[PDB]
Design a protein around this ligand. Sequence first.
Ligand SMILES: C[C@H](NCc1ccc(C(=N)N)cc1O)C(=O)O
Ligand SMILES: [Ca+2]
Ligand SMILES: [Cu+2]
Length: 223
Amino acid sequence: IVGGYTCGANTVPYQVSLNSGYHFCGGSLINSQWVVSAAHCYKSGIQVRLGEDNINVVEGNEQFISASKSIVHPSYNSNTLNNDIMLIKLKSAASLNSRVASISLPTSCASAGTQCLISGWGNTKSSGTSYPDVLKCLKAPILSDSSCKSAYPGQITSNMFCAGYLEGGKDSCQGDSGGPVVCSGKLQGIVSWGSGCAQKNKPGVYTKVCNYVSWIKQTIASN
Ligand SMILES: C[C@H](NCc1ccc(C(=N)N)cc1O)C(=O)O
Ligand SMILES: [Ca+2]
Ligand SMILES: [Cu+2]
């Protein structure tokens, strides 16, 4: 997260860290046994870490659970990043409490101008590399479809939306991938892609979760 602020220990209870000997992607807990993340975050040997703040220190409240299976959307296209969504089933159910809780799936899509909260342990610098120990937060608005498409001509599908600031200076970044974009208590987006980080006229692009609610529910029910 570039241009954000320190969230505060366990203030984002649904945020998860995907770990393979190091933090490589974010994710969101949607129920005691399932996590939603980005398809481009797929890899074998994933350990899901819940209840984290400082990812380099065991502070208490953490729950480390191995992923039993990862389900990348069947129509995911790695070249266009269309359908960049993945479901991860935990080997064992997580213990839900005030520090580890699930986030609700949307019942309808969010409109332009809606303020959302984006979080992650990704790079905090626009020009360079600097990974934080603690979770970072950023409040950002969903942009109009016209502004999104003018920023990324011919690259925005109906399963994507832009969020952030055109003036630059505030945006999600590498390492935030797969993380949550929560608006009014509902998970509306997944950190997917963008051009660089916090560059002017180049807002972040996110997977439009409201288009996948039926797919998520039907997939979870059959696994
Ligand atoms: C696909 C992945 N990039 C992810 C990615 C995520 C967020 C942003 C952003 N500015 N909001 C930019 C990115 O390039 C990667 O190349 O590792
Ligand atoms: Ca920790
Ligand atoms: Cu990238």
